Amino acid sequence: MNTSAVFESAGLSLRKVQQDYIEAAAGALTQDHKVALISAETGVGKTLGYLVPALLILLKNPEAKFVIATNSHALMHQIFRSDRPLLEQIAEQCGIKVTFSRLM
Amino acid sequence: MKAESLYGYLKERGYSRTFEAVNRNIYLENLRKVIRKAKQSVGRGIRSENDTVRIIILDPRFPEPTDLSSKHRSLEHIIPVRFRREYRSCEILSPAYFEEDIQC
Amino acid sequence: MLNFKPYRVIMSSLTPVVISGIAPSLDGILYEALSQAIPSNEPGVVLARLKEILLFNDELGVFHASSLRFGITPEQGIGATTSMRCDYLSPEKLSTAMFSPRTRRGLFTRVLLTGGPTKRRMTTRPAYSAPYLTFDFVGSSEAVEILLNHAHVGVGYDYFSAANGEFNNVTILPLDIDTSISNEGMALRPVPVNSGLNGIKGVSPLIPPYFVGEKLNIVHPAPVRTQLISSLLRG
Amino acid sequence: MNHPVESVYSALTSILLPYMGEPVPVQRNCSCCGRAPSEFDGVGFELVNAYRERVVHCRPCQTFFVSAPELMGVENPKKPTTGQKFGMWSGVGAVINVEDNSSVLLAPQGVVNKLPEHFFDHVEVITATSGQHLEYLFNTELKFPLIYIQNFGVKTYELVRSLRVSLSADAIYTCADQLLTRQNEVLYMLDLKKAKELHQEIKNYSKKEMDIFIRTVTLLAYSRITPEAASNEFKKNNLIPLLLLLPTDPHQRLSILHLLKKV
Amino acid sequence: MRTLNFNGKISTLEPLTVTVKNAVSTSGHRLPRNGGFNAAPYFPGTSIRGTLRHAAHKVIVDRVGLNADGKSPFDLAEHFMLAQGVDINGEAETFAPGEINAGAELRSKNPLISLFGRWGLSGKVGIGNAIPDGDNQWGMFGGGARSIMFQRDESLMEFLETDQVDRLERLLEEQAEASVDISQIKTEQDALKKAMKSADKDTKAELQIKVRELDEKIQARKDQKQESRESIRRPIDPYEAFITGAELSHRMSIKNATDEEAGLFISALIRFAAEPRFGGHANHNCGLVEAHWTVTTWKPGELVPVTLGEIVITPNGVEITGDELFAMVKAFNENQSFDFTA
DNA sequence: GGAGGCCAAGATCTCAATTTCGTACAAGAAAT
Ligand SMILES: [Zn+2]
């Protein structure tokens, strides 16, 4: 739906491997009380993989806030340096412009 | 410790499994975590689409391409699928039975 | 209807493989597997769905699915085993609880297991026990992998009854050249005689199932073919 | 009419017509060969076997169940009034020349002894056991097409349904009273052309070299030695040209090796 | 009409052994190997298929029950049709060989024959070999020896009269004499095996026939023993079995299955769990298994498995899981249309 | 008194041979 155009029309380098993960993650997150199981190797930007679906769902009942659990500074503070200068762009183009969180 | 604890829990719960079966189950689970850890290790080589990494496995127990009946046959799953051709076309430092068998 | 690439599928042989004269072709295995997946004993629908996952040679009438070729390693090679079906007339099978035997003087007439229509059938069948079975085919890799891994198909004869030719660890690897029908003029599958491919003359249908329909003159490879596993994985 | 059982009947068991009897016309396909009555001219032999089963035999099939003690001798002294039956012979082979209609009966010495002298007039009987059948096939100049009943056996139904005419020396069908399905014809296919050329080339190799070759191939066919070890033995003993003559089928390898170890 | 694939694991409660003519040689009892002695053995799918067919036959007889006379309604012909699948009376529906889908009437009326075919009619139940998952999951079990009871315990000699303590002394002297003789005869036999190794071919055939005369001499010395015929102090050869708690992977499948045939199969599995015994050496309790089967099916129109339930056979009970499995079992139980007869 | 039902004989023979899985690290807490 809008996600793909607002991604590529934002200048961001959408990949073929990215679209299937975006759609699968969003569709799995639609199912309430179910659990999603994904392997996404290096190259799919799993951060974005489970971030763009969060903004697709945000369109519906945007009050819903999302927790992103992480292991360590190995993967945390990559998301800080990715979601701020990559996601906020499409969020702007998607009008979402939502606020980030830190709970470390 | 894990073997005896799990055997204790399966003996109090009532499951009639031998201790050897539990040892094999924990061994398989450890093998799975080994495959995951080595997948992380291989993931440390590539982090960008332009990366070109020479992966050197000096372990004699890594399965050769030709030895499909090797005990650790799962261990080529550390290699991504997209490089499995390079797994099949690889340089072996200390190969075995590199002669030609006439009973082809 | 789908794009088809030349793939080679190699599976670890768990059971000896009873070869029914002609080498078992991968299209027959896939036809059994699709006969299960979509439950159908009607050949037409199963053939139609097989064409959706396997390439079909219209000018020859055959599927791009080479016959069985045993992959032999330097440790284990092709071996001559006997797939042996024996009737087991257990003491519970020879009991009045299951059936009413003919009676004389209160004595139950014993079953003549030595000879006769009620004998202990001892059916021995040549089987070949090689470490790996390899087939070459042109088709959809995901579909064939799903069928071979999660369907009750084996290689050889009577896998649905004798569990002969059970395989696991199905590995599909892409090939560079189509070696499913022909290889340097040597037929790798049952092909019609008019194809000009040289091999072993025989009588069989071309398309599966290979026990129905008119059995026409074909050229088929050596029933037992062996290759080094290294040469098969060379691609 | 045009079936292997008719060929063996005319060649070999047409000697027991005078003790066979007049057929009784029937309406069902012969239970022994299984073929339809369209070629039996509508007639047949009605018979009951030792299991009390109503069985129809055609003119060729019935010959295997005929008791002719005055021609074939007494098979068991405890039952004098029944003689040797072609369908009850075990360890007895026969080569039927279909075109010539002549037959040679490869019987063991005991069977030859039991046969009266009148039998040898109609049928040329050579004293040979089941082990010397391959010797006779190897040495003698066979005339094709032929039917090679390796073992008449007692399972007459499986012998008749196993009868295959051997059109040439490349594929000689050894019918041994075991049902010749397409799954076990490899055990019953004798590739005498290849066996003969392999025996011709075995002459160039020493006795020890040929024993080593045979043992290596037998062990490999039974998967007792690794292919690497077998290849090492072949290369060290220079047996590769022998191996190039071997069929890739291990059962065919075992058959031809049995043939070599017989000759 | 759904192809139920049962995939799952058989855990071996007591060692799982089977005697196969090719597998067993004079070297000893070995499991079928599919290769050399170094290969991984497999429990044949034929033995499991026969066990499940026998269990299904027991289910069918119990469901039919007995007549008013207390005798089973099945005769020898019907019994062999349901157990071994071969026609003994020559009265069977000889369907045309070119009709893959033939026998629908017999398949509906006889679900046992439908699952496990008869001759001339393909079956619908395909049982697989129990493939071990490990590398050292088999071994030489059983064996031991048949110790003489009176040379082990002397308490058992206070219960024999002198006329039998002298028959014991005579049977032990006969055993020792015979074992010495057989020992020297086997020594000469092995020297003859060596001369076959030579195979000088001068008189090899005669050497074989004298070896045969020697086996006959073994049987003569072993008929001279007039108190016993076999040496009682016998070392028992071990049989090869899968180790206790061996995880063997098993694929079974019913293809194009009606709810009635599938329900009959599940009832056969349920009854088999009463005596979950595979293979032989039941004297040593060999063959006791507990097995969990994940019953999957193929999605209509796609190549995807959908899980319908699990069949967990354990010594604690059979845990049928999934509503469709219960529906199949109830459909088989409730159908009063089966005529397991001619 | 002809139908079962059990039991003994039929001559020959192929061939093949074994010695021990896996040995760790992190990072990161509002606590059990
Ligand atoms: Zn006939």
UniProtKB/TrEMBL annotation, chain A:
Residues of the full protein shown: 1 to 104 of 624
Similarity comment: Belongs to the helicase family. DinG subfamily.
Protein name in UniProt: DNA 5'-3' helicase
Native species: Klebsiella pneumoniae
UniProtKB/TrEMBL annotation, chain B:
Family: Belongs to the helicase family. DinG subfamily.
Designated name of the protein: DNA 5'-3' helicase
TrEMBL record, chain D:
Record's keyword terms, sorted: Metal-binding, Zinc
Superkingdom of the organism of origin: Bacteria
List of residues binding Zn(2+): C30, C33, C58, C61
Name by which UniProt lists this protein: Uncharacterized protein
TrEMBL record, chain E:
Keywords annotated in UniProt: Coiled coil
Top-level taxon of the source organism: Bacteria
Stretches of the chain forming a coiled coil according to its record: 168-231
Record-given protein name: CRISPR type AFERR-associated protein Csf2
